[PDB]
Design a protein around this ligand. Structure first.
Ligand code: 7JE
Ligand code: CL
Ligand code: CL
Ligand code: MG
Length: 213
């Protein structure tokens, strides 16, 4: 099997169904003790939690589901009725993420879309009945952070106060995105220094709040 299948099985066998916290803990244990994986992890995850709690977003878009770690992490903190949409291009990972969400009992809160962000973003308004997004979590290919931020704006999906939160702004890094948002009058940016998941390597999140045109 694959690493991602092994992570899912480990959760199924070491967490409690319907208990998101147990699911996170199981993933973090597996990835610390058995096999590293590109989940956002607990260090950066704690920062994400603090941001979700601050903003209590009603509608979150995630770009880059992977195995569903961050989707579990965010969705468990959403208020009743709030929703997460997550985009994943890799069909095997989309299926893992769905199964992970199902195990966690969060499937009613989350919609996992299997496809490329640049193809799905233009469909959000008409096909998924989105007006504007409260928060966006960027965690897909690092060279897509900037193009997809610009596409979200073009498609009318950002409003005053939309929170963009970007993983991996140091490692692997997303230099064009970071330069752009930090140089733009349309964003108010904050850097949250942290560590790469499961590693003693500095990484960080960037929060960029959209201010309108
Ligand atoms: C277009 N589109 N639309 C939806 C969508 C979804 C995907 C996949 O979810 C996918 C697959 C492969 C890689 C990524 C990005 N993630 C990373 O590359 C990453 C790397 C590292 C790291 C760090 C140190 C290392 F040494 C090696 C890897 C640490 C991290 O936290 C990461 O997030 C995302 C891809 C394109 C997509
Ligand atoms: Cl993740
Ligand atoms: Cl960690
Ligand atoms: Mg990441």
């Amino acid at each position: 099997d694959t690493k991602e299948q092994r992570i899912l099985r480990y959760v199924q066998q070491n967490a409690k169904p319907g208990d998101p916290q147990s699911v996170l803990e199981a993933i973090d244990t597996y990835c610390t003790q058995k096999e590293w994986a590109m989940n956002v992890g607990d260090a950066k995850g704690q920062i994400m939690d603090a941001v979700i709690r601050e903003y209590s977003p009603s509608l979150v878009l995630e770009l880059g589901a992977y195995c569903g770690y961050s989707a579990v992490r965010m969705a468990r903190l959403l208020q009743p009725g709030a929703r997460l949409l997550t985009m994943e291009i890799n069909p095997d990972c989309a299926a893992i993420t769905q199964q992970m969400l199902n195990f966690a009992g969060l499937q009613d809160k989350v919609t996992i879309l299997n496809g490329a962000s640049q193809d799905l973003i233009p469909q959000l308004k008409k096909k998924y009945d989105v007006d504007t997004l409260d928060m966006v979590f960027l965690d897909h290919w690092k060279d897509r952070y900037l193009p997809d931020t610009l596409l979200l704006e073009k498609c009318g999906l950002l409003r005053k106060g939309t929170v963009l939160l970007a993983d991996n702004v140091i490692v692997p890094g997303t230099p064009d995105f970071l330069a752009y948002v930090r140089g733009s009058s349309s964003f108010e940016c904050t850097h949250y220094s942290s560590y790469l998941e499961y590693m003693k390597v500095v990484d960080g999140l960037e929060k960029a709040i959209y201010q309108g045109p």
